[PDB]
Amino acid sequence: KVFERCELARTLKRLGMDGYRGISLANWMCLAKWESGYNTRATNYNAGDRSTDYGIFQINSRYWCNDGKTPGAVNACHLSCSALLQDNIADAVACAKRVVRDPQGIRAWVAWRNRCQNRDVRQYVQGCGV
Ligand code: NA
């Protein structure tokens, strides 16, 4: 599924993302926009290290979900990577929450540093009623 902006923002608020481990909803929105374009079925193979990024938050198979074909990988969210390609984003959000519980937080995603950090991210939630 490809979410519309405000539809996602309302969804993430209901799922308790606003202010999770210190991260405002507008930041999660900026992350999803730059990682996947709000697309749950997005995948990106990384040829360099044989890992894959899965779903709306482009969560990596080396550390967070199991896809069986990543060498030396762990499965910190305790999920098949498949779970992160559903239209329903409950499991993806729970895994995102797990990612940010590590010391790096939201900095775990290089896209967030490039595109979101120190920016005016208000635009991603404006007019959405959240
Ligand atoms: Na894994």
Curated annotation (Swiss-Prot):
Disease tied to this protein: Amyloidosis, hereditary systemic 5: A form of hereditary systemic amyloidosis, a disorder characterized by amyloid deposition in multiple tissues resulting in a wide clinical spectrum. AMYLD5 primarily affects the viscera, and the predominant clinical features are renal dysfunction of varying severity, and intra-abdominal bleeding. Inheritance is autosomal dominant.
Principal cellular location given in the protein's record: secreted
Subunit text: Monomer.
Localization: Secreted
Pfam families reported for this sequence: Lys (PF00062)
Molecular function GO terms recorded: identical protein binding; lysozyme activity
Active site: 35, 53
InterPro entries attached to this UniProt entry: Glyco_hydro_22, Glyco_hydro_22_CS, Glyco_hydro_22_lys, Lysozyme-like_dom_sf
Described function: Lysozymes have primarily a bacteriolytic function; those in tissues and body fluids are associated with the monocyte-macrophage system and enhance the activity of immunoagents.
Keywords noted in UniProt: Amyloid, Amyloidosis, Antimicrobial, Bacteriolytic enzyme, Disease variant, Disulfide bond, Glycosidase, Hydrolase, Secreted, Signal
Reactions catalysed, as given in the entry: Hydrolysis of (1->4)-beta-linkages between N-acetylmuramic acid and N-acetyl-D-glucosamine residues in a peptidoglycan and between N-acetyl-D-glucosamine residues in chitodextrins
EC class name: hydrolase
Species classification: Eukaryota, Metazoa, Chordata, Craniata, Vertebrata
UniProt source species: Homo sapiens
Ranges for domain C-type lysozyme: 1-130
Record Gene3D superfamilies: 1.10.530.10
Record's miscellaneous remark: Lysozyme C is capable of both hydrolysis and transglycosylation; it also shows a slight esterase activity. It acts rapidly on both peptide-substituted and unsubstituted peptidoglycan, and slowly on chitin oligosaccharides.
CDD domains listed in its UniProt record: LYZ_C
Name listed for the protein in its UniProt record: Lysozyme C
GO cellular component: azurophil granule lumen; extracellular exosome; extracellular region; extracellular space; specific granule lumen; tertiary granule lumen
